């Protein structure tokens, strides 16, 4: 039983596009869940290396999905420009 007040507060938040963060545009499955290529088979040795790849446009895309898409067309379908890797 005591009085506890607050004078000021400091917080940290991150901004990102909703349409891409809520669900990947290439693969319709959940980003945290396994991709379609990884979901089709689980005994494969490539099922543990599918992660989220970011870029300059702050878009989230699966590593395998973006790697396969980069084969024919290198411009990102969302902003229609050159995709670049920043982290994984």
């Amino acid at each position: 039983k005591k009085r506890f007040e607050v004078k000021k507060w400091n917080a940290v938040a991150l901004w990102a596009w909703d349409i891409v963060v809520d669900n990947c545009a290439i693969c319709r499955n959940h980003i945290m869940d396994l991709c379609i290529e990884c979901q089709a088979n689980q005994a494969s040795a490539t099922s543990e290396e599918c992660t989220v790849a970011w870029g300059v446009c702050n878009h989230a895309f699966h590593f395998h999905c973006i790697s396969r898409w980069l084969k024919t067309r290198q411009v990102c379908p969302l902003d229609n420009r050159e995709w670049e890797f920043q982290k994984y």
Partner: peptide, 22 residues
Amino acid sequence: RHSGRKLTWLYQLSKGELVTNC
């Protein structure tokens, strides 16, 4: 100010301050 994008507030790195007089 901005449309088509939300904010993901982080609390593990956040901090504040409180005052007590009891």
